[PDB]
Design a protein around this nucleic acid. Structure first.
Length: 224
DNA sequence: AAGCAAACC
DNA sequence: TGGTTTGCT
């Protein structure tokens, strides 16, 4: 049961506007890993906006954590919306907190919302800290930390550390896991928008699961 | 923005 | 495999 007044209010307000009809397909979409209230993003953003109508920064981790502990998935989605409002106060001291969010209530919807934006931004400012986390994540056999290691650079474009990217991919290319094979294909395809020749050379000369290779070269294969 | 792509099956 | 739904940048 949440103790922070803001979370209490959000819980009451979301619950007051739940839609059981929508809840069922939303839950099915996430392979029924989570309960849903049945509130999609536009309404969920409006309901969050109602409650803002913003707690001191000292509270933001407590608020996020309490929301993460609530059963229905919309509360974790709201928590990420809230974390965005504290963007300027998030720094390298918060990486362990982000780790906790990644490995708790884990699924692609939360992890993909955490990793390329919040972790991506942190490691851009603190690239000398990557070696303290990325190898650990690779060795963890937690697929969501592994996906984090792959996707934190997803939006980097010209800022991509190519050698690092390819090393990470090499470490994880033999994973049987769909979410890892797919993340590899995704990040390669995305980076190929920036540096297509380098991605082509990588996939032509380094082993990848067929899913990963196909997804990587989806848009550039017609150029070679 | 709308061009894109995560899921889903 | 590739069409559908939803949401991000």
């Amino acid at each position: 049961v949440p103790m922070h007044p803001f979370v209490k209010a959000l819980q009451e307000h979301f619950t007051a506007h739940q839609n059981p009809e929508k809840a069922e397909p939303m839950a099915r979409y996430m392979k029924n890993h989570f309960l849903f209230l049945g509130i999609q993003t536009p309404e969920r953003r409006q309901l969050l906006k109602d409650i803002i109508q913003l707690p001191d920064q000292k509270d933001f981790q407590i608020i996020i954590r309490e929301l993460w502990d609530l059963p229905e998935r919309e509360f974790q989605a709201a928590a990420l919306d809230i974390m965005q409002k504290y963007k300027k106060h998030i720094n390298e001291t918060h990486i362990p907190f982000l780790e906790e969010l990644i490995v708790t209530k884990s699924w692609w919807d939360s992890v993909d919302s955490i990793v390329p934006t919040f972790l991506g931004d942190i490691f851009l400012k603190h690239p000398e800290l990557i070696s303290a986390y990325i190898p650990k994540w690779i060795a963890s056999d937690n697929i969501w930390l592994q996906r984090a290691a792959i996707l934190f650079q997803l939006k980097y474009k010209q800022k991509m550390d190519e050698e690092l990217l390819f090393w990470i991919i090499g470490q994880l290319h033999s994973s049987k896991e769909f979410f890892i094979q797919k993340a590899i294909g995704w990040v390669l395809r995305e980076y190929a928008k920036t540096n297509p020749d380098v991605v082509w050379e990588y996939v032509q000369n380094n082993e990848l699961a067929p899913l990963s290779k196909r997804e990587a070269i989806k848009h550039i294969k017609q150029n070679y």
